Assembly symmetry: D3
Homo-oligomer: 60 residues x 6
């Protein structure tokens, strides 16, 4: 499987490392797929590039 995760910028390298690990395990375990077949892409969004309800997520 291939996962792309969009998260707001601001997290530590460590947190992102954990995220990649935990999500990979969750996917592998969920589908009974080899862990090595799981590929994860993290894409960070600048606070001014994410909107919710037409408002910058940063201010809502």
């Amino acid at each position: 499987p291939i996962a792309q995760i969009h998260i707001l910028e601001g997290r530590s390298d460590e947190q992102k490392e954990t995220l990649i690990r935990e999500v990979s395990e969750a996917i592998s375990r969920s589908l009974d797929a080899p862990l090595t077949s799981v590929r994860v892409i993290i894409t960070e969004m600048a606070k001014g590039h994410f909107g919710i309800g037409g408002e910058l997520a940063s201010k809502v």
Copy 2:
């Protein structure tokens, strides 16, 4: 709904703010969906990362 918009880098924060607003309204109005259910992601492309017809968009 969830919208991801790919635009070439170079726009002001303001223009991007407007973009997020107008697009969210257009989506909400178009589908009769609550505005708060609309999430927008803007992804900027470096001029050297967008091609059209095999040529850098920057030079075509």
Copy 3:
């Protein structure tokens, strides 16, 4: 610009047609970009393929 919109399945062709139009206008007007430069992709999600808070959107 290039926009990809993820929406739950269930809308009429007409509504999707409107969505494509309104969103294209909103983008063109927002960035002062030629309308013809706006490309829109609609991607529908089966009700069982969209989760919110770990629950199928269909039941939350």
Copy 4:
């Protein structure tokens, strides 16, 4: 956060339900983010639409 997962077609509804749950928990726990802020999109690929090394995944 917003996650999009690309998986080959063939899994049961149940497996996909589990996937959405486990992945949402993994993301929430990994980033200390409210579970309700996690949105997951599953996108299935037809066996003839996924290539690895230039070969259809189906035959490699």
Copy 5:
């Protein structure tokens, strides 16, 4: 590398097979990357789901 290609529905399985091959070779050769490291995803769009300039691609 990971490539996702959005194309309008209507092509034969064969054409899509070729597409996956040629694109994989082009990527591998372009970056001097092992062919086996190239993964390709083809995503087809229904004619009513692709807009250009606010009009359905089908009618423009």
Copy 6:
């Protein structure tokens, strides 16, 4: 067609230029589509944002 290519950061501008060209030609030739109808987006991933088997690609 519209192609989005995810590659790890580190390549020269030149290599990316070539990539855009070769991939565009491969797509145009593969589908017998006008070269000018091919649009390519390159998205670079920071080494700490790409995971394989739950491990940072950088260290596997």
